[PDB]
Amino acid sequence: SRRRVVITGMGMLSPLGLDVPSSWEGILAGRSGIAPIEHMDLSAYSTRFGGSVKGFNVEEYLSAKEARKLDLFIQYGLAASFQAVRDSGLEVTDANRERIGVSMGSGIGGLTNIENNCRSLFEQGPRRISPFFVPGSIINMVSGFLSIHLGLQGPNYALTTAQTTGTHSIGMAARNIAYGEADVMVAGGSEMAACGLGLGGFGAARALSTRNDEPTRASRPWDRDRDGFVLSDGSGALVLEELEHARARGARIYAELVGFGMSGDAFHMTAPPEDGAGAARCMKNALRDAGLDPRQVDYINAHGTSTPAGDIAEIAAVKSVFGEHAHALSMSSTKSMTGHLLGAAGAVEAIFSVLALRDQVAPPTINLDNPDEGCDLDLVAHEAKPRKIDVALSNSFGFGGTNGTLVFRRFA
Amino acid sequence: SRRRVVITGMGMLSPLGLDVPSSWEGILAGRSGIAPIEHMDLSAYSTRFGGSVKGFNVEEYLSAKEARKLDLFIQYGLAASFQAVRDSGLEVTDANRERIGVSMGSGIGGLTNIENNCRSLFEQGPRRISPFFVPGSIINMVSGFLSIHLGLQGPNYALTTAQTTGTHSIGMAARNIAYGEADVMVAGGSEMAACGLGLGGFGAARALSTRNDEPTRASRPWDRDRDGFVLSDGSGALVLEELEHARARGARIYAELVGFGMSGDAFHMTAPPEDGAGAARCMKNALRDAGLDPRQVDYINAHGTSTPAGDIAEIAAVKSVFGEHAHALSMSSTKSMTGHLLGAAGAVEAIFSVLALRDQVAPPTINLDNPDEGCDLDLVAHEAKPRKIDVALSNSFGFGGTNGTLVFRRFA
Ligand SMILES: C[C@@H]1CN(C(=O)c2cnsn2)[C@@H](C)CO1
Secondary structure (H helix, E strand, C coil): CCCCEEEEEEEEEECCECCHHHHHHHHHCCCCCCEECCCCCCCCCCCCEEECCCCCCHHHCCCHHHHCCCCHHHHHHHHHHHHHHHHHCCCCCCCCHHHEEEEEECCCCCHHHHHHHHHHHHHHCHHHCCCCCCCCCCCCHHHHHHHHHHCCCCCEECECCHHHHHHHHHHHHHHHHHCCCCCEEEEEEEECCCCHHHHHHHHHCCCECCCCCCHHHCCCCCECCCCCECEECEEEEEEEEEHHHHHHCCCCCCEEEEEEEEEECCCCCCCCCCCCHHHHHHHHHHHHHHCCCHHHCCEEECCCCCCHHHHHHHHHHHHHHHHHHCCCCEEECCHHHHCECHHHHHHHHHHHHHHHHHHCEECCECCCCCECCCCCCECCECCCEECCCCEEEEEEEEHHHEEEEEEEECCC | CCCCEEEEEEEEEECCECCHHHHHHHHHHCCCCCEECCCCCCCCCCCCEEECCCCCCHHHCCCHHHHCCCCHHHHHHHHHHHHHHHHHCCCCCCCCHHHEEEEEECCCCCHHHHHHHHHHHHHCCHHHCCCCCCCCCCCCHHHHHHHHHHCCCCCEECECCHHHHHHHHHHHHHHHHHCCCCCEEEEEEEECCCCHHHHHHHHHCCCECCCCCCHHHCCCCCECCCCCECEECEEEEEEEEEHHHHHHCCCCCCEEEEEEEEEECCCCCCCCCCCCHHHHHHHHHHHHHCCCCHHHCCEEECCCCCCHHHHHHHHHHHHHHHHHHHHCCEEECCHHHHCECHHHHHHHHHHHHHHHHHHCEECCECCCCCECCCCCCCCCECCCEECCCCEEEEEEEECCCEEEEEEEECCC
């Protein structure tokens, strides 16, 4: 058998806001967090815009001195995590600290730190590399620093599954609790790759929208005029908790995590198969895990990156899985507003899926002006749609053909 | 209910050999793989030696056209994975490809590739960044490329827990199989951090031995004259397989994976606590997981990094866990010979633990000329010790206070 897992705390930094409620308010209003990137000469770059976190104050969380040791992606991870633990009301004690763990991940990790230390190295040689370069740049330091700060002695690890990281981190944390390896986990992801290396790296693959004249219209999932994804920064953290543990302390439960699916496409390094066979296996795995019929799904938070082949693969996968129910569910890409937070995408989109359940509303796909060939599902174009949502899916489909699906259900 | 997990295939690149048998012959002969580094000019660095893979031929595994796109850590990971799969005798079919997954991790991933593309960005511009920069550098792409080449459609992910990566990857892959998420997993880790940023970064932390004039004597775990770890490159992969699945196809079984432990120190970003409290909690978790009396433990492949604080913390942990039995078991650090393969350390050392079971021999801790204060266990100083080994334990500890323990035993 298996224990039930509930969500009792959420935290976030996104292009829409410095916490969950501000980000969510932007989502339901169809606001874009996309704009030209500042304090950087992007003259020679083919993309000059993305989703930056605006007005982040790390000194609300850490001393200036501890913040100087950590890459931005680690700072963002810690902010989301501290928000989530505070939101949960959880009290860490000597009696439970061995039962509380962390799995906060990243897709690309410390590019900003790698950049600034390469500068030192190339200009001045290796003796000018920061002593904290390694511990301050590696992806497991969100989990590391969080565990040290809060005294968490439970499972301590980090996933890195590129654009699937957040979804996998949450799913595998849910497994830790379900199979009795932990009673509580902080899980999700963080990313800051809106540096030269991220813009330059994705730019050289020609994977980014180049709609520099109108950055807010760049991210347009399933629209016939999409030309690639928008690079964005931020973090998402959830407090996952065994149900009886949540009930005993009188926690506020947002939703239940009922299903987790994984699959591999085994197809291509960056592109999905046209029919999204892998994404279909992954969703079917997640519904089987939850013991749910495809007919019971009401809302899907799509991966919906605004890549030509990715968006169309997801339509095919949803039609394949849901058959005569594919048109009755609502599916939206909040990446139309947030851009693509890569490893943090699945974390912020799990939070948006939980809030869709709490508020009984499907977030919009903004910029969906002319749906492409066969994009004829309910994609919640332009404006938020109040509706019945008992079951929400959140999908992530990343480089290496790695797939994750989370299934959340209303809790009463 | 929980299924049994066996090892049916193993693969390796190490400083001692281009496969498992050649690496193991070096381990048993007390041979060092440590030498001045030849692939770059280290005259400005305080450490100029490490464990390099010597004469790696990627054209034993991959077309030169493909290899040119991939960081060395991906090449090394794919080579070890290919070896492990061939060694298993497993045939991938339409009937089982959904049940076979991959979890190959890395501490740092494609630092060489990121450094080289940062040089292009700074000296020329973004137009000179490689189109293959992201899929050739990010940590999840061993799992990705392996799945694409062999057609593995099962769980596809990657851990990054610094120096604990290989142990966590293998343990969590075993849990996947134990709980029914997969029947077969390819699991382990790979690392190639021997570039300017890696040697410079660890150098800036003063974490490395600076014994440049006697590289083979630099790695001296528990020796009173140790002065830091020796940086090494390579990969380990194991094919983990559900027991009945292995029995049904007549697989050769090397050993059974009976126990997996994790814990967080919640102590310090980089320093292990002197009392080894987190390592002790981790080993106790693993022994309880394996249903064992601690007196059953015959052999411990120590983390044994040759740091002052790391080596003494492990003695304290082993004494605390095993009490008087700590004087009867054998504990050795193969890092005395291989150096520290970081995220790959746990993977090669899991392989060495299994071969310790197959051949009934404890590998030596070379260079243990003057055991330090309180390092008075059987540390298999200088020479391999033939002995009875029914149960072998492999320990890993990493930055962020992250701990892993694997427990293997003979299969009958
Ligand atoms: C493994 C796939 C295919 N590949 C090749 O270089 C290749 C080699 N033989 S046929 N194609 C790159 C696109 C990497 O991803």
